Paper text:
LARGE1 (Like-acetylglucosaminyltransferase-1) uniquely synthesizes matriglycan on dystroglycan. Matriglycan is a linear glycan (xylose-β1,3-glucuronate)n, which binds proteins in the extracellular matrix that contain laminin-globular domains and Lassa Fever Virus. LARGE proteins consist of independent xylose and glucuronic acid transferase domains arranged in tandem. Matriglycan on dystroglycan is indispensable for neuromuscular function, brain development, and efficient arenaviral entry.
We first confirm the structural integrity of our LARGE1 construct by light scattering techniques and single particle cryo-EM reconstructions. The tandem Rossmann-like fold of the catalytic domains of LARGE1 was built into the reconstructed volumes. We found that LARGE1dTM forms a dimer in which the active sites on each protomer face opposite directions. Our reconstructed volume of apo-LARGE1dTM does not differ globally from that of LARGE1dTM-DAG128-340 enzyme-substrate (ES) complex, except for a density for UDP-glucuronic acid which only binds the latter. We further showed that, whereas LARGE1dTM in isolation cannot bind UDP-glucuronate, the LARGE-prodystroglycan ES complex formed using either wild-type or a T192M variant bound UDP-glucuronic acid. Despite collecting data at zero- and thirty-degree tilt for the ES complex, one of the xylose transferase domains in both apo-LARGE1 and the ES complex remained poorly resolved without imposed symmetry. However, despite elucidating the relative positions of the active sites in the reconstructed volumes, which imply that matriglycan is likely polymerized by switching between the orthogonal active sites on different protomers (arrow), we were unable to deduce whether matriglycan is synthesized processively or distributively on dystroglycan and how polymer length is controlled from the LARGE1 cryo-EM reconstructions.
Residue numbers in the entry:
A (entry chain A), B (entry chain B): 134 to 279, 287 to 384, 395 to 752
The structure:
């Protein structure tokens, strides 16, 4: 009843990571038995998938990872032309990689979707007889009908059933190696990668292959002409999207399905105790539900499913080791800023987007449909899926900061447009002020405007002229000047060299710091006191606040978010935010003692 | 295998409508057999549920409605104090209301959630023996332990299994009527409404009751103390939320589940042909997928699940029959306007919100947590659930217009704040201009501002002064003046009486019209040409555009929506919008002929 079903998936890259996320969602939507995933992945995919499954907390799912690079030398001698690359040749060597104590496994591809319970496919293992060990579905295309030799139409490696014990007893490694060498002696190339090799083995030993029903692998490829195979669309099971209305709706069902709905244990089967799940349960049990601020404390320890590098990412290390990454976080309603930011900052960017699955797909379509975003590869998109009622601003900031590729980071905001050439200016400033060997934070002055149509200045003199004419203002000039009052804009107007300032109450500048800067406090959600706590923690750790003369950023106006609108620092939210501020002050007093006394009167 | 399962639900009110939506979602998430819902509902709930199920298009679900008011006289003689009111006493008379050809039924309450397949509960009907006909779960509270007499702890009417044929053969009506009369001779009142009466029958004839397992009705009431009943939380089936962490997560699973995922047919069972579903399938099949504008044409005919009156609504007819309803539509990112609008317009408001299920719950929490929104009952919230990629602005406008309660409607916008007292001014203007007997549209001048902090003028003179100082501008003054150019603001500055204007190219004012105004064209989605087509249709039907002297509205600035940002009338969206404009012009030429020739050069 609770028999563990083992699924082996080969993943490599960010696109493959998204595809395997979709496949795992499809499998979990129909599962009824414990699942053990064996992910053969390179480091790029391994980090993403490990973080995703750690934060996902799916009950009765055990995930293990295997170094795909170590297997490259196993297939480095086989030329390949399939778009999956060398990683497509690794499904042959799974018997060498998977643990020796495993008997049966279901090998899948990243472009597979499940419309039925995977236990039904696992039950097919009971029907194997004789020496049949590879459960394969006959190819639905005329590719092998005349390519690599195959039996009949050939078999498709999109879904495979393997009996590892029998393959190991029969020395599958030597068999497939000899078959591949013999085929490559004349073919000299592979058209469909290891799949072709599979067919070659099927030619030599047809008795090893068990022909599964066609509806276990519905290949929607070009010129498929398989209408008879899926004539009964109601009873279709597994779909393969190998293409370079019901199917579209089914795909969109899982592509936009909420993954947090999968955090429910399997009935009748014990769930293994995970450290993160146990910690979350203990912390939530410690919280008092009678307290009026229960929601905020619950959101503080809430673990959000995080998908690092949601889009393709590339980066090259800086030769001078002084590179700076723009760090910001945003929700969906701020997407219009992104392109503008990409037009101002030419350096690496690390963003944390708080999107739902539907919003994640909308953002993916927007990014793939935008020339500006597709022309830039050094922008890191880390999607933190929505959960709870409040906006985890500090959690998003921590996610963005932790996954940068540069020694220094600028803790900017998505609503702020920087000046042109600020990237090179900060790269020079870190060398000039020697931030590597000192605890110094370089403050970038913040300005705000109320006009959407703005002629962005190309120099500091033009910015001063615009300030004189009343078009621009210092940030929060009309509401709360205490935030940037210690910036000393009056001295900044005529300053030609960076100058040090001192911390004051409610100070919250925008700082360029090192990679190892202390993290934000996750206890603050929504709007208010988010950056004040971080600036206080910076000051208590002996950080020197330095204002640069020739740097500035302008806060473009934005409609109030639902966070502000609902919890506009009034009534229950104001009381809870004051309580959180008091708790943070108490923790500051306890942790550092004498060095943190001056913040009590702040 | 495909046996039809009949579920009887009593619904009354908007809160009950939301609850029954949640219950239906919970039932459909676990169903495996055809479902036939019998909804005993009053007109208020009947309209909402009929529209919701018509737009929902759930396969293998047959919904029928029964007049609950006609049954009131059947229980008008029984005093009741339960918060469900007289509608709570109707479950007794279901045998009188349901069709005589039905044998077995499952009676549910609006506060029920299903965590297991309802076919499992329907299979319990096979286990009935003897004269046991009411499948009930013993009450889990000490309410009946000492109230109305009961057997043991009593039985809970949250979930009932009825054999209608046997009840009719045994004359259940007379039995329960006599039992209720005898009990009320001494009790004189009902504490738990018909439930108490049920228990009384259980006292007289205990052999009629079949005691279901406890986990078929898990009552989470106050002082429940039933930990033993749900000690195995993994294998819990039906939850009753009769209260005035796993349970919370389970409730939020269905409260925020996407209902459009339920539009999948049951495997192995034929689906009945519905007129709306057939029309949608035919229209989508007619559309060419090779056309680059496939998405827009698909969205044109897409049927969106509509939930009329998502919150409690009250209204009183105007004595003079000249009342005007502010009609507007908005998405989530415009919620901050609502309260402001409620501070300006004291009359009835009809709004159409394009929210997802999670966004619907967020809006419900915001509205229940806001004093301004809870103090106003004449605001109609019609939620149109998200589907597709584009914003159905015209569909939302049609939904808002069609469900107003007043003879006249103002086709305003959510981004526009009206002047104080505009409600009474328009109520006087409709009488002054005699819009009842003439085809006249009263134009309200539109202005825009770029400053979020605005001192709203209390008179026209102050508005003129603000215009002179450059603080305010006419709407789209800096971008596209053609939209409100025919408004003739120069004449409006000194005008003291309403004056007629003439239609011009791309004219798009904001008009007060009658209830029977022609609807918007649903072929336009996103942003662009949405109101131009409606104004052209108004002009081609001989509507006189009248500008009022002492009326104005100010367009508060807003961050660009994702619709503008992505499809900012550029590239593919611009081409598709131009194509839609051309098609609308062709339809205008064909439908009216000579009277529509002047729009070709527009
Ligand atoms: O730096 C500051 O001075 C202030 O910045 C924000 O306050 P504010 O800008 O008024 O409010 P938002 O516009 O909601 O916050 C801006 C930042 O939050 C993000 N954001 C986006 C969308 C959303 O709904 N909520 C939200 O907080 C934006 O992407 C951006 O990074 C913080 O919430 C304050 O705690 C802080 O004092
Ligand atoms: O009112 C008008 O005359 C014009 O409104 C919009 O032009 P614009 O104001 O630039 O764009 P929006 O800000 O999208 O229009 C305001 C309306 O759009 C609604 N809205 C809200 C949110 C959203 O995502 N999309 C959207 O269209 C708002 O609720 C409000 O009713 C349309 O693009 C024009 O076709 C229409 O004629
Ligand atoms: Mn901001
Ligand atoms: Mn607008």
């Amino acid at each position: 009843k609770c028999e563990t079903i083992h699924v082996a998936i080969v993943c490599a890259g960010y696109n493959a990571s998204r595809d395997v996320v979709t496949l795992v969602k499809s499998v979990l939507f129909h599962r009824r038995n414990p699942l053990h995933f064996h992910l053969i992945a390179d480091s790029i995919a391994e980090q993403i998938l490990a973080t995703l499954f750690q934060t996902w907390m799916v009950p009765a799912v055990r995930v293990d990872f295997y170094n795909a690079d170590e297997l490259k030398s196993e297939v480095s001698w086989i030329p390949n032309k399939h778009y999956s690359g060398i990683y497509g040749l690794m499904k042959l060597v799974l018997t060498k990689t998977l643990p020796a104590n495993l008997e049966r496994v279901i090998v899948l591809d990243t472009d597979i979707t499940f419309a039925t319970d995977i236990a039904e496919l696992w039950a097919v293992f009971h029907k194997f007889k004789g020496q049949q060990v590879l459960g394969l579905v006959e190819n639905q295309s005329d590719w092998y009908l005349g390519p690599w030799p195959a039996l009949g139409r050939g078999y498709n490696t999109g879904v495979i059933l393997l009996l590892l014990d029998k393959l190991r007893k029969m020395k599958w490694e030597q068999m497939w190696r000899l078959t591949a060498e013999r085929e490559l002696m004349g073919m000299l190339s592979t058209s469909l990668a290891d799949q072709d090799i599979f067919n070659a083995v099927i030619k030599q030993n047809p008795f090893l292959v068990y022909q599964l029903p066609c509806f276990w692998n519905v290949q929607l490829s070009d010129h498929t002409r398989s209408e008879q195979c899926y004539r009964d669309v109601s009873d279709l099971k597994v779909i393969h999207w190998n293409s370079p209305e019901f199917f579209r709706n089914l795909y969109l069902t899982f592509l936009e399905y909420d993954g947090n709905l999968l955090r429910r244990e399997l009935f009748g089967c014990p769930s293994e105790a995970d450290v993160n799940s146990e910690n979350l349960q203990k912390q939530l049990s410690e919280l008092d539900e009678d307290d009026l601020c229960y929601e905020f404390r619950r959101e503080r320890f809430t673990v959000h499913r995080t998908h690092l590098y949601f889009l393709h990412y590339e980066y090259e290390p800086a030769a001078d080791s002084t590179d700076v990454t723009l760090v910001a976080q945003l929700s969906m309603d701020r997407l219009q800023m992104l392109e503008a930011i990409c037009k101002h900052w030419e350096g690496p960017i690390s963003l944390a987007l708080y999107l739902s699955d539907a919003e994640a797909q909308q953002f993916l379509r927007y990014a793939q449909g935008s020339e500006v975003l597709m022309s830039r590869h050094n922008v890191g998109y880390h999607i933190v899926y929505k959960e709870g009622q409040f906006y985890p601003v500090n959690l998003l900031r921590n996610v963005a900061m932790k996954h940068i590729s540069t020694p220094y980071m600028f803790l900017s905001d998505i609503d702020f447009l920087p000046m042109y050439g600020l990237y090179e200016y900060l790269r020079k400033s870190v060398i000039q002020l020697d931030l590597a060997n000192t605890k110094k934070a370089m403050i970038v002055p913040a300005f705000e405007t109320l006009r959407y149509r703005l002629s962005f200045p190309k120099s500091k003199a033009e910015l001063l002229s615009m300030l004189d004419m009343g078009t621009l203002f210092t940030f929060r000039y009309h509401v709360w000047t205490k935030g940037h009052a210690p910036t000393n804009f009056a001295k900044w107007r005529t300053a030609t060299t960076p100058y040090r300032v001192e911390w004051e109450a409610d100070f919250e500048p925008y700082v360029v710091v090192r990679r190892d800067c202390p993290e934000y406090d996750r206890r603050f959600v929504g709007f208010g006191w988010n950056k004040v706590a971080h600036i206080m923690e910076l000051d208590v750790q002996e950080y020197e606040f330095i204002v640069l003369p020739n740097a500035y950023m302008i806060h473009m106006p934005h409609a109030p978010s639902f966070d502000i609108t609902k919890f506009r620092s009034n009534k229950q939210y104001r009381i809870c935010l004051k309580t959180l501020k008091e708790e943070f002050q108490q923790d500051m007093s306890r942790r550092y003692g004498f060095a943190a006394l001056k913040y009590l009167t702040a």
